[PDB]
């Protein structure tokens, strides 16, 4: 045995009487002393002892001892002596079925907690033991065992589905299935619960007994007990995902069952049922099985979307479940509408019609939500009703009730495509006017709704906002003074999305006047390692890009923090690479946006960036990122390099030696964006190095020729590849020119399709130079070059004379009669263009 010091046990029983004192400040100082005793080891032996052995005590006092012990298992189990432990473990299991339900709960919570903290392979007597106890003839022992087993399957499902314990599932699962039949409804619900853990993992023991499982489920269809029903519903939802086949046969039966449950009095059951419709809808067989029932279903869902009376109360002054019947029904409706398209409206529209206009607001509100939910897939079918509705909704933006104001903002944003595709004055103007008001609404929910809807609307509207710009910024900037936290974040989105939507139009001193100060104000106060510098980078990145050169005043502090972060990150990635156990791996998304913002300033400020580049190790850092193993990073640096190259090649040329070989290796089209931006940045440095490029040409060229001839490459890599070749041959024709016959054809084919611009120009100068040097590359495929030259509408004159000399050079080589015959295989527009423009 173990005996406790009776003189010291009367002591503990006092503490336990004081922990139950009403007086707040007694409780305060008594608990700090019970914390104190943890320091010493035997103490926990006194607790399990008060619980399980001292029947001369108050039950609340006993249960409290076990709960205190329990909490000492959560903190401080590494500090448990293995004798205290083993006394506890054994002492729990002898009383797992105590006659007192309060004690039995307490004992049970200990067991599951010890099993959870001090893992299962360290208590391997337990499962075996708990199984054998299910069979117990004593009911309370059975229930106890099963309650524990249940929490264990919940906590430890992956470990049980593992050799760690020698596949103990193979015995228990079939064992559990037996207990679906049991007298008690509690034992029935435990059994189903345990089993449901192992459905989605496709646990072997269960997949092989699937038919027992299903027959057994089906046999509980008609159970009065919510907790049983809840668990049946969970079971059927999961099955649906993994083992569609086995229950397809019985679908209609199942479906009628779920439809009942979806309406169940008890909202737990309801919600669990509702999940069905949602996960059913993602199943390619769905569309047929269900159609018969849409009639009955739609209104069950729609009726589920009203706020309850209690929902409403918690929303006056998030304060409510992030998942509930309302969201679930509503989400189901969105998926349905994307499957059934307009086939859905006959089942909905009439409901809408009387909900939207209904006089009680809760109902009108759910009307609006529905209308929002169906928007995406019922769009076409809704067009005819919108001229009535969109104006109706613009009205409700000023409704007395905020929950009507906010959902209205949302629903309007779902029809933003249509609104923007009309006369701006009928629908868009008054919409945008009311939104802008609501952005400054007194209520936080309405702000978030309104600001988000605005940002959404802005994306669809694009350049149509330029009239209202003045009015928009007034509102957005003023909102900085109101908004905090979650709504502030939506606001940066709103401003970012604005800049992206109008671009340069936003460059005007009066606009930059009001906008920039409060942003750079916010830029500083929020701290590196803050939740919110991520949305603010992306805000400034958008703005900076739209503002162009007008950004300049403001970019020192933005540059510095960007460089800082790129470094700070690589600092950590290093450590983590060498000592991964002690060092937190970094979050690269921080770096990727910084590089993208820096790349944004390089295009934007152009040359004026230069001096900040000089003062910083931006180039070393870039060097490091180009070898980074995540492709998004390599891609964001090559992008940056090409920009820096144009903006200020003088600070770059130093590092070229080192870069070109890295660029060389990254010309691999498996990762397209990197290959693209690498191809691009060698193009751009060609032009700045000119002739001095020639040492480096051997290390890239065969791979570029590789890529352009290599099929199923996206349009705009080839375009960049062609371009870049041209730009090499422009500055080192001697080395590039001999390769001409291999790339001339896909090169022409690819660039005959792009707009007369500066890249086209610089690349075609290239081809012309190489043709002068190896005039026999083109003679095989000369019609391809004719075609590409005829793609120019209005070329620079020098370039026009270059083509002119080539075209006639050839017509003279082959003679008039050969030429005429050659050009008869030209399409009219081309033949005539060349004959008129280059005189040929």
């Amino acid at each position: 045995e173990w005996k406790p010091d009776e003189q010291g046990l009367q002591q503990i029983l006092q503490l336990l009487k004081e922990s139950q004192s009403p007086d707040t400040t007694i409780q305060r100082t008594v608990q700090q002393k019970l914390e104190q005793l943890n320091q010493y080891p035997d103490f926990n032996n006194y607790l399990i002892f008060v619980l399980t052995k001292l029947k001369s005590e108050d039950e609340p006092t006993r249960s409290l001892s076990g709960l205190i012990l329990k909490n000492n298992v959560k903190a401080h189990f590494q500090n448990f002596p293995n004798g205290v432990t083993d006394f506890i473990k054994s002492e729990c299991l002898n009383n797992i079925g105590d006659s007192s339900p309060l004690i039995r709960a307490t004992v049970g919570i200990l067991i599951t907690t010890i099993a959870s903290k001090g893992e299962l392979q360290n208590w391997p007597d337990l499962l075996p033991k708990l199984c054998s106890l299910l069979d117990s003839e004593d009911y309370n022992t059975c229930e106890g065992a099963f309650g524990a087993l249940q929490k264990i399957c919940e906590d430890s499902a992956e470990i049980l589905d593992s050799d760690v314990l020698d596949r103990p599932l193979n015995i228990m699962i079939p064992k559990f299935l037996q207990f679906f039949k049991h007298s008690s409804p509690k034992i029935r619900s435990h059994a189903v619960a345990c089993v449901n853990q192992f459905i989605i993992s496709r646990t072997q023991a269960l997949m092989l007994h699937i038919d027992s499982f299903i027959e057994n489920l089906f046999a509980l269809a008609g159970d009065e007990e919510p907790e049983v029903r809840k668990n049946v519903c969970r079971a059927l939802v999961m099955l649906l995902e993994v083992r569609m086949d086995r229950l397809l046969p019985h679908m209609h039966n199942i479906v009628e069952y779920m439809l009942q449950r979806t309406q169940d009095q008890d909202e737990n059951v309801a919600l669990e049922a509702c999940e069905f419709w949602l996960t059913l809808a993602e199943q390619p067989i769905c569309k047929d099985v269900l159609v018969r029932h849409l009639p009955k279903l739609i209104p069950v869902l729609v009726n589920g979307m009203k706020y309850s009376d209690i929902d409403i109360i918690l929303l006056k002054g998030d304060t409510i479940s992030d998942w509930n019947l309302r969201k679930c029904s509503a989400a189901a409706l969105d998926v349905l509408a994307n499957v059934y398209r307009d086939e859905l409206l006959p089942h909905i529209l009439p409901l809408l019609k009387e909900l939207l206009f209904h006089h009680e607001w809760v109902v009108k509100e759910s009307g609006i939500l529905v209308l929002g939910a169906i928007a995406e897939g019922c769009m076409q079918g809704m067009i005819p009703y919108l001229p009535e509705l969109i104006p109706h909704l613009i009205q409700c933006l000023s409704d007395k009730k905020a929950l009507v104001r906010s959902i209205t903002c949302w629903t309007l944003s779902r029809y933003a495509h249509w609104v923007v595709s009309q006369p701006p004055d009928t629908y868009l103007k008054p919409l945008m006017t009311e939104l802008l008001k609501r952005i400054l609404d007194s209520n936080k929910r309405v702000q978030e709704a309104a600001c988000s809807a605005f940002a959404t609307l802005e994306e669809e509207a694009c350049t149509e906002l330029v009239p209202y710009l003045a009015y928009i910024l007034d509102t957005l900037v003023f909102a900085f003074s109101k908004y905090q936290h979650k709504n502030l974040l939506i606001l940066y989105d709103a401003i970012g999305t604005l800049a992206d939507s109008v671009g340069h139009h936003l460059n005007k001193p009066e606009y930059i006047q009001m906008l920039m100060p409060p942003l750079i104000q916010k830029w500083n106060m929020l701290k590196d390692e803050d939740k919110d510098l991520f949305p603010l980078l992306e805000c400034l990145s958008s703005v900076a890009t739209a503002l162009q050169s007008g950004f300049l005043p403001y970019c020192e502090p933005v540059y510095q923090r960007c460089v800082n972060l790129v470094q700070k990150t690589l600092a950590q990635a290093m450590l983590n690479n060498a000592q991964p156990d002690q060092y937190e791996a970094p979050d690269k998304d921080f770096m990727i946006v910084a590089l993208d913002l820096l790349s944004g300033l390089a295009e934007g400020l152009g040359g004026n960036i230069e001096q900040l580049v000089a003062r910083s190790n931006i180039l070393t850092l870039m060097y490091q990122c180009m070898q980074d193993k995540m492709p998004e990073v390599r891609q964001s640096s090559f992008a940056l390099l090409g920009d820096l190259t144009k903006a200020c090649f003088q600070h770059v040329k130093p590092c070229i030696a080192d870069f070109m070989p890295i660029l060389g290796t990254n010309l691999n089209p498996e990762f397209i964006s990197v290959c693209n931006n690498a191809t691009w940045a060698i193009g751009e440095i060609s032009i700045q190095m000119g002739i001095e490029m020639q040492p480096y040409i051997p290390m890239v060229l065969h791979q570029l020729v590789e890529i352009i001839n290599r099929p199923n490459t996206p349009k705009t890599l080839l375009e960049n590849t062609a371009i870049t070749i041209g730009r090499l041959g422009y500055v080192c024709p001697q080395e590039v020119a001999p390769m001409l016959q291999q790339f001339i054809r896909p090169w022409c084919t690819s660039l005959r399709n792009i707009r007369d611009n500066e890249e086209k120009d610089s690349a075609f100068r290239g081809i012309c130079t190489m043709i002068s040097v190896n005039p026999s590359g083109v003679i095989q495929d000369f019609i391809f070059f004719c075609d590409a030259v005829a793609s120019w509408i209005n070329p620079k004159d020098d370039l026009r004379d270059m083509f002119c000399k080539i075209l006639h050079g050839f017509k003279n080589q082959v003679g008039d009669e050969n030429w005429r015959r050659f050009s008869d295989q030209f399409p009219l527009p081309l033949k005539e263009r060349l004959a008129a423009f280059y005189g040929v």
Binding site: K327, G372, S406, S452, T456
Partner: peptide, 7 residues
């Protein structure tokens, strides 16, 4: 990260 009553 905008308002969405379906998620």
């Amino acid at each position: 990260t905008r308002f969405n009553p379906l998620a």
